[PDB]
Structure formats: C-alpha cells, structure tokens
Amino acid sequence: MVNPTVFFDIAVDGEPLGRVSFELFADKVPKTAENFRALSTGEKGFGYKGSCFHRIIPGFMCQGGDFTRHNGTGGKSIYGEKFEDENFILKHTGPGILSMANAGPNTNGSQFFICTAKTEWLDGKHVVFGKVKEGMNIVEAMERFGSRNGKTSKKITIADCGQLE
Ligand SMILES: CC(=O)CC[C@H]1C(=O)N[C@@H](C(C)C)C(=O)N[C@@H](Cc2cccc(O)c2)C(=O)N2CCC[C@H](N2)C(=O)O[C@H](/C(C)=C/CO)C/C=C/C=C/[C@H](O)[C@H](C)[C@H]1O
C-alpha cells in the first residue's frame, strides 16, 4: 500500500512557525517507519508531542525526539527501550532525509534527525526511513536558531503532530 504521511507543527518559544510533512518509507523499513508513525500519532500513550529539537547545526542536521528526559539522552521506541538496526538500504542522499539517531549498534529509540544536506559519511551509520515531503522552508527556518555546536538560541518544539490520510 501507500507509504504513510505524518506531520509536525513546529513552534519557536511557543509561537507557531509551521508544518513539516514527511513520507515514511514503510515499504523499505517497516519496523522503523511504524515506530515513527506511532510516536507521531501518540496512539500507544506516549510520543513526540510537546518534545523539542535539542541539537540543531545549520547546514548539517536538526535532531530531536527525546520525550522522556528532554535533555538529549533519552527517548524510547514502541517496541521497548531499544530496537535493532533494520537495514541500511537507504542513503543520506540530500536535504530532507529522515534518519534514526543512535548510541551504537541496535540502539534505536525515538531520537531522529532531519538532514539539511547530502552527507555521505553518515551512510551505514544510521538507518534512513523517510523524507520531508512538504515544509522544507520550515526546516530552513528552524536552522536559523541553531549554532555550530548545536545549542539552540530559542526553544524549538513540536507543538502538535499526527498522521495525515
Ligand atoms: C544515554 C547517554 O547519556 C548517551 C549520550 C550520548 C549519546 O549517545 N547520544 C545519542 C542519543 C540518540 C541517545 C546520540 O545523540 N547519538 C548521536 C551519535 C553520533 C554522533 C556523531 C556522529 C554520528 O553519526 C552519530 C546521533 O545519533 N546523532 C545523529 C547524527 C548527528 C550526531 N548525533 C551529532 O550530533 O553529531 C555532531 C556532529 C557530527 C557535528 C558535526 O559538525 C557531534 C555531536 C556529538 C555528540 C556527542 C554526545 O556527547 C553523545 C552523542 C551523547 O549525546
């Protein structure tokens, strides 16, 4: 069937910025895609709603997804604290690529990053599972608030999120 579409409504210090939409590559990485989908709807009782982007590096990536500790060290998946690296079929081929952050092999949780460039050296190191479908302009706007070391000058939060059909 068709790949799912989820969206994030982004805010800056509580003020709405816009919506970014993503396609999840469920035909390639079903387990990884399903985790992100369910975390976006909130249907298992926990998820990205209300969490923030803790590390933003202009020209490289925007990372978020820690809804358990809210400091960059937490997050969990719908299957448990960690799940395996499903495969490394997809590559970090350009801006808008959605990939899973990790702390070593087979430690996928909820943290993810959005690529704002093609970065070959990431390949084989992270599982790619989607891409920005619409709202790339919104991702660019979020970048204005990051810095070389990743610390944001303003709170960038996911004010709301879900699935679109
Ligand atoms: C439980 C605990 O305390 C662990 C904290 C530790 C960590 O493992 N954080 C994890 C999260 C997911 C739990 C984490 O986040 N992993 C990074 C690891 C990484 C670092 C550098 C390159 C890389 O490919 C992977 C992760 O998956 N991402 C996604 C891709 C970009 C990368 N973070 C990143 O931010 O790269 C920066 C980069 C390459 C900038 C280039 O300009 C350099 C930052 C390093 C941070 C190190 C932390 O002390 C360590 C991750 C800690 O959080």
Secondary structure in 3-state letters for 95-117: CCEEEECCCCCCCECCCEEEECC
Dist. CA 38–CA 42, nearest whole Å: 6
CA-wise closest residue to 40 among 16, 71, 5 = 5
What separation in Å is there between the alpha carbon of 6 and the centre of ligand 1? Answer: 25
3-state secondary structure of 121: helix
Dist. CA 24–CA 6, nearest whole Å: 8
CA-wise closest residue to 29 among 113, 77, 103, 90 = 90
Resolution given for this structure, in angstroms = 2.1
Angle 53-124-128 (CA atoms, 0-180°, nearest 5)?
45
* Amino acid in the structure at residue 41: T
3-state secondary structure of 30: helix
Active centre residues (catalytic)? 55, 60, 63, 102, 113, 122, 126
CATH of segment(s) 1-165:
2.40.100.10
* Amino acid in the structure at residue 141: A
Whether ligand 1 lies within 6 angstroms of the CB of 102 is answered as yes
CB atoms within 10 A of CB 21: 15
Dist. CA 132–CA 103, nearest whole Å: 24
Technique used by the depositors? X-ray
CB atoms within 10 A of CB 19: 16
